[PDB]
Design a protein around this motif. Structure first.
Motif, PDB file in Angstrom:
ATOM      1  N   UNK A  58      26.915  -6.102  19.437  1.00 58.10           N
ATOM      2  CA  UNK A  58      26.270  -6.130  20.772  1.00 58.10           C
ATOM      3  C   UNK A  58      25.749  -4.776  21.226  1.00 58.10           C
ATOM      4  N   UNK A  63      21.180  -4.007  16.959  1.00 54.80           N
ATOM      5  CA  UNK A  63      20.218  -5.080  17.246  1.00 54.80           C
ATOM      6  C   UNK A  63      18.784  -4.543  16.946  1.00 54.80           C
ATOM      7  N   UNK A  64      18.415  -3.402  17.485  1.00 56.71           N
ATOM      8  CA  UNK A  64      17.104  -2.824  17.096  1.00 56.71           C
ATOM      9  C   UNK A  64      16.905  -2.654  15.615  1.00 56.71           C
ATOM     10  N   UNK A  67      15.996  -6.010  14.265  1.00 57.88           N
ATOM     11  CA  UNK A  67      14.646  -6.432  14.702  1.00 57.88           C
ATOM     12  C   UNK A  67      13.569  -5.713  13.897  1.00 57.88           C
ATOM     13  N   UNK A  76      10.710 -12.557  11.810  1.00 60.19           N
ATOM     14  CA  UNK A  76      11.187 -12.437  13.134  1.00 60.19           C
ATOM     15  C   UNK A  76      11.800 -13.723  13.689  1.00 60.19           C
ATOM     16  N   UNK A  77      11.406 -14.857  13.107  1.00 61.59           N
ATOM     17  CA  UNK A  77      11.831 -16.191  13.486  1.00 61.59           C
ATOM     18  C   UNK A  77      13.292 -16.462  13.018  1.00 61.59           C
ATOM     19  N   UNK A 139      27.851  -5.984  31.763  1.00 61.38           N
ATOM     20  CA  UNK A 139      27.812  -7.479  31.727  1.00 61.38           C
ATOM     21  C   UNK A 139      28.024  -8.066  30.359  1.00 61.38           C
TER      22      UNK A 139
ATOM     23  N   UNK B  28       0.261 -11.599  14.853  1.00 58.94           N
ATOM     24  CA  UNK B  28       1.021 -10.640  15.658  1.00 58.94           C
ATOM     25  C   UNK B  28       0.316 -10.347  16.964  1.00 58.94           C
ATOM     26  N   UNK B  51      19.219 -11.546  32.560  1.00 59.38           N
ATOM     27  CA  UNK B  51      19.128 -12.776  31.815  1.00 59.38           C
ATOM     28  C   UNK B  51      20.431 -13.053  31.059  1.00 59.38           C
ATOM     29  N   UNK B  52      20.767 -14.320  30.957  1.00 57.78           N
ATOM     30  CA  UNK B  52      21.926 -14.811  30.208  1.00 57.78           C
ATOM     31  C   UNK B  52      21.556 -15.414  28.875  1.00 57.78           C
ATOM     32  N   UNK B  58       8.859 -20.088  17.491  1.00 56.99           N
ATOM     33  CA  UNK B  58       9.053 -19.571  16.139  1.00 56.99           C
ATOM     34  C   UNK B  58       7.838 -18.743  15.695  1.00 56.99           C
ATOM     35  N   UNK B  60       5.854 -15.368  15.862  1.00 58.73           N
ATOM     36  CA  UNK B  60       6.303 -13.986  16.135  1.00 58.73           C
ATOM     37  C   UNK B  60       5.811 -13.303  17.443  1.00 58.73           C
ATOM     38  N   UNK B  63       8.278 -14.113  20.065  1.00 59.71           N
ATOM     39  CA  UNK B  63       9.564 -13.401  19.806  1.00 59.71           C
ATOM     40  C   UNK B  63       9.394 -11.925  20.130  1.00 59.71           C
ATOM     41  N   UNK B  64       8.319 -11.309  19.666  1.00 58.87           N
ATOM     42  CA  UNK B  64       8.120  -9.891  19.994  1.00 58.87           C
ATOM     43  C   UNK B  64       7.986  -9.607  21.406  1.00 58.87           C
ATOM     44  N   UNK B  67      11.528  -9.520  22.841  1.00 59.61           N
ATOM     45  CA  UNK B  67      12.262  -8.283  22.325  1.00 59.61           C
ATOM     46  C   UNK B  67      11.828  -7.036  23.083  1.00 59.61           C
ATOM     47  N   UNK B  70      13.365  -7.478  26.530  1.00 61.21           N
ATOM     48  CA  UNK B  70      14.823  -7.199  26.615  1.00 61.21           C
ATOM     49  C   UNK B  70      15.042  -5.708  26.472  1.00 61.21           C
ATOM     50  N   UNK B  71      14.240  -5.058  25.646  1.00 61.30           N
ATOM     51  CA  UNK B  71      14.385  -3.567  25.530  1.00 61.30           C
ATOM     52  C   UNK B  71      14.151  -2.828  26.837  1.00 61.30           C
ATOM     53  N   UNK B  76      19.166  -6.126  25.170  1.00 61.71           N
ATOM     54  CA  UNK B  76      18.961  -6.551  23.798  1.00 61.71           C
ATOM     55  C   UNK B  76      20.101  -7.421  23.266  1.00 61.71           C
ATOM     56  N   UNK B  77      21.275  -7.345  23.906  1.00 61.69           N
ATOM     57  CA  UNK B  77      22.448  -8.147  23.466  1.00 61.69           C
ATOM     58  C   UNK B  77      22.326  -9.640  23.867  1.00 61.69           C
ATOM     59  N   UNK B 139       8.483 -20.875   5.114  1.00 65.51           N
ATOM     60  CA  UNK B 139       9.931 -21.268   5.073  1.00 65.51           C
ATOM     61  C   UNK B 139      10.397 -21.701   6.446  1.00 65.51           C
ATOM     62  N   UNK B 140       9.795 -21.150   7.501  1.00 66.23           N
ATOM     63  CA  UNK B 140      10.295 -21.413   8.850  1.00 66.23           C
ATOM     64  C   UNK B 140      10.254 -22.875   9.257  1.00 66.23           C
ATOM     65  N   UNK B 143      13.241 -25.609   7.985  1.00 65.70           N
ATOM     66  CA  UNK B 143      14.557 -25.623   8.635  1.00 65.70           C
ATOM     67  C   UNK B 143      14.478 -26.036  10.116  1.00 65.70           C
TER      68      UNK B 143
END
Lengths: 249, 249
Positions: A58, A63-64, A67, A76-77, A139, B28, B51-52, B58, B60, B63-64, B67, B70-71, B76-77, B139-140, B143
């Motif tokens: 955590x 984590x970075x 990523x 990234x998925x 938190x 991207x 955020x919780x 899926x 990127x 997702x980016x 990220x 969150x940074x 980021x956790x 591959x993504x 699954x």
């Protein structure tokens, strides 16, 4: 080997170059730590690694690192799970102190035991400690699998193993057996503790093993999730020796 | 409203400047889209969001975007989960064509239904389409909660809502009802589809609604998880207006 796993530790920071322990203080990667992680992703891409799951601590540095690696792979998925159980060792009251300060407040021999030994636990951070609030007011620690007061206030290397092992057994291990290719982005002590378990390394010998940062560590595991032979460092042999020299002594 | 939800869409790219639909092509962010993500993080920080949990697609670019956000927040956790069911609309055979190529290959009137209507499904991509292999050999998509062959090959906005809803109902909604503060990092169509559902917006009205990029969209929800009032754009009202204008034409 039936199964194969990759673990690594993030590049270390400014405090490390001044022989201070970051521990649970959530320091960011420097640009160096960023290049180190990108360099792993490239190397792993060159090896055509295809991950199905990532596990991190955590602490944002780990984590970075994960990523930046998944980005270098175009992965990234891939799901990322994070756990305090992969956190660096908690150095307790020693957090933030340089070599000289630790030695003065506690004595050179005590301090050597606390860094070097397997089972001797540093004194716990107390609420008066300048980084107590910065850790336990966060938190992050209010939503762990144990209550916030059940969380350690200091740790030996053995104590690391003991809180990591259940995460390995209950969360990571089943994924390995399911045939998934796992990346673990962890820290110096968490990585060392995990290897101790997987390779059945002695209490005596774990103290001396070194783990270079920013190097893919390959584990080949058998039916019982035990290492088949020692861990292997992946990549160019000269970047690996440089990296080993950086973590020497 | 008992509950608050935040949703946003990533910064659009060069194809969108060219009136080509990126759709399930995993492009991207460009430098613009990255900056927008950071700015949104700074905006969420100024507002003190904590955020919780975070849901993304899926692809990127979403997702980016999470990220980067969150940074900016030091968060980021926070768990990230990703799902194809948050993916941008699948434009099927129209992927990669500009408007002029679409109209030449399909007829102009037919092209405008595929783009503007709520429920007309474009023609499916076939194995001959130049982007088919890049989506379906990835591959993504092997699954997902549905087999590769049950995955859509094209979609109307209605088809997007219908494949988003089971993710909302089974994954997201139960966390909102637990009191978690959720961030959804999605796409133009997946954000529109979700807002339509939660606010009870008509098939007619959904089409004209403004969804700027890089802007926090707040929904307040009651116990049945129905919007109390309209969604609100958060932040600096003049950047919101810059943002709105850039989606308008």
């Amino acid at each position: 080997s039936k199964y194969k796993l990759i673990m690594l530790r993030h590049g270390e920071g400014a405090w490390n170059k001044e022989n201070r322990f970051c521990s649970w203080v959530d320091q960011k990667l420097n640009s160096e730590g960023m290049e180190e992680a990108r360099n792993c992703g490239k190397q792993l891409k060159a090896l055509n690694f295809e991950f199905d799951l990532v596990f991190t601590s955590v602490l944002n540095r780990s984590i970075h690192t994960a990523w930046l690696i998944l980005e270098e792979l175009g992965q990234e998925w891939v799901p990322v799970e994070s756990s305090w159980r992969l956190n660096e060792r908690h150095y307790g009251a020693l957090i933030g102190l340089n070599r000289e300060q630790m030695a003065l407040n506690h004595g050179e021999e005590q301090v050597r035991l606390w860094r070097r030994s397997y089972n001797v636990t540093p004194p716990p951070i107390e609420e008066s400690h300048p980084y107590y609030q910065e850790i336990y007011n966060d938190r992050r620690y209010k939503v762990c699998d144990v209550p916030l007061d059940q969380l350690p206030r200091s740790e030996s290397l053995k104590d690391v193993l003991e809180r990591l092992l259940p995460y390995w057994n209950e969360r990571i291990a089943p994924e390995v057996l399911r045939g998934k290719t796992i990346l673990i982005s962890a820290h110096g002590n968490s990585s060392r503790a995990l290897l101790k378990h997987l390779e059945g390394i002695s209490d005596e010998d774990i103290i001396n093993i070194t783990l270079p940062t920013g190097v893919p560590i390959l584990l080949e595991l058998d039916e019982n999730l035990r290492a088949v032979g020692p861990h292997q460092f992946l990549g160019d042999q000269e970047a690996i020796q440089a990296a080993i020299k950086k973590v020497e002594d």
